[PDB]
Ligand binder design. Structure first.
Ligand SMILES: [Cl-]
Ligand SMILES: [Cl-]
Ligand SMILES: [Cl-]
Ligand SMILES: [Cl-]
Lengths: 178, 178, 178, 178
């Protein structure tokens, strides 16, 4: 029985390029987390308490997703490499513009998973593609969700009354099409 | 004891014109079903989740109504004839215009039942007029309901805030005057 | 942030050939639905109440599967295109022959999903292959199930007593090997 | 305030031909009752306990239907006229032949109601047509039911095993398509 790079018993070696891609994706999701935290604060600063609560929970969820990836590296007996975290964006001209960044950030998160996925397929790492499958499924749901929130906010067309109504929807947990 | 056209024991023969009218009405209700499905999708595409949920349920209900008619033909020992289903309308310029088509589609469904009803009266088919009576009663309730939804959406006069409020009413199941 | 063909925010563009394949598959499943409805009626016409109940539920389930696909197109910000629905087959010489068509229809449904699946792999659309994975798993279960029902009916070898026994099994919900 | 023929206050006079038709129909349903009793006995004599139980209950139900008609005459302040009851048929060569008579007897019961119904329409007696409407609805259900039982027994094609299976279905209360 051989030892993996993190010292645990090694079930199967992992391509170093694939390892680097996973460690980088963990950074993407940690960055999405602090980005949602920044968005939470921006919303709280404008008394959009429902949006604040939503993004506060989104920040904690994204962090969980990131930690889920660190557990997989442990499971594969690979080293983690927790990297420097950039500062998030913190300024937006409007809720609509913030929601656009939020959607793009979710779509970008999926793109990063897809990049890892293609690398695992190139290396025939079926453990990794199986590991990623439900995470892609969750990304589809999050993309559907953020397109719903973005589109609903754009439908409001900057009217505060409509934004207050949507804000209260979010505070109540009404956050997707259902 | 004689056998009906579908092979079951025959309680009383049915005029072939009346049979054709019922088979055609089953198509009307199947078409209303796929029409409400199309309307559900149009609403979902614009993040009108309450309207989406309402029309998704309306599609399943209309299909039930159609199957209820197939059961009556079985009960009368008559053959069913499930026909080609046209594609539904799928494009509207506005929610108000969609709701207008929905109301017209409900009124048209009633007209088709009324046409069957008059044919049964001409043929003195009291089983059929009795069978249709509660379905006409349901149509009155659906017409009242769709006139309420249409009129409420027209009252909104295209304002997104008002449409979001109505959307949330539908998501909560507040779908008629009560 | 770009807009998809159905107007929603677009997480990633979809190949038009893949879109057409999904819209066509939705038709396959809608057609399987009305086919099971026709089979329900054929069974009811011959007092095979258990088979009637089974196929009535199978029709509603297939329709749900179809709507599940329309939701995915919405989630991907792609247009739906609900198409003309052919009339189903409605005549069989025997229950055994009906069950043969039912099994073939289920196997054909899987073939259509597999065709979509290969197209998504060619286009590296991992959202779609992930989306299809549990639907293929369900198809395996349905194929196993319909092979069980078909084989059990063939074992009866046209004996009415055996068919009545199986009919009662279906009415009780005993519809697979367990 | 005028008095009706049975001495009660009279809401509206009833055509004597319509009165006679109702009194005659009450005889039809009393005769259907004793006929189902005879069928119950025939089945019990051949150890077909499920069919015996079914027809014993059918006899009591038909009697209830008859009494429901006497209550309507009372409600209309019309005299009842309980008539001589013929002896029922009591001999059949087979269960299939008995079930054929049972179905015909149910269809004949509906024909008699339809005859009353047409007479009330000729006389514009809307109380009577309204009174008869749910009874016609019940007749549709009974015709559907007896066509199911007859067809299932004919499917058995005289095989005792199949008849024992159906017999047990009836004893369990499985008496229609459901
Ligand atoms: Cl805004
Ligand atoms: Cl509008
Ligand atoms: Cl067979
Ligand atoms: Cl027999």
């Amino acid at each position: 029985v051989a030892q993996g790079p993190n010292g645990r018993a090694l079930a199967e070696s992992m391509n170093p390029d694939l390892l680097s891609a996973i460690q980088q994706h963990i950074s993407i999701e940690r960055y999405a987390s602090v980005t949602y935290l920044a968005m939470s604060i921006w919303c709280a600063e404008r008394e959009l308490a429902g949006f604040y609560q939503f993004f506060d929970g989104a920040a904690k969820d994204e962090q969980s997703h990131a930690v889920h990836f660190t557990q997989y590296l442990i499971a594969r007996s690979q080293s983690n490499d927790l990297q420097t975290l950039d500062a998030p964006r913190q300024n937006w001209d409007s809720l609509a513009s913030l929601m656009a960044t939020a959607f793009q950030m979710e779509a970008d998160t999926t793109s990063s998973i897809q990049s890892v996925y293609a690398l695992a397929e190139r290396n025939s790492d079926t453990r990794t593609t199986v590991f990623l499958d439900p995470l892609i499924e969750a990304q589809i749901q999050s993309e559907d969700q953020f397109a719903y929130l973005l589109g609903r906010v754009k439908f409001a067309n900057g009217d505060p009354t409509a934004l207050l109504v949507i804000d209260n929807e979010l505070r109540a947990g009404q956050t997707q099409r259902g």
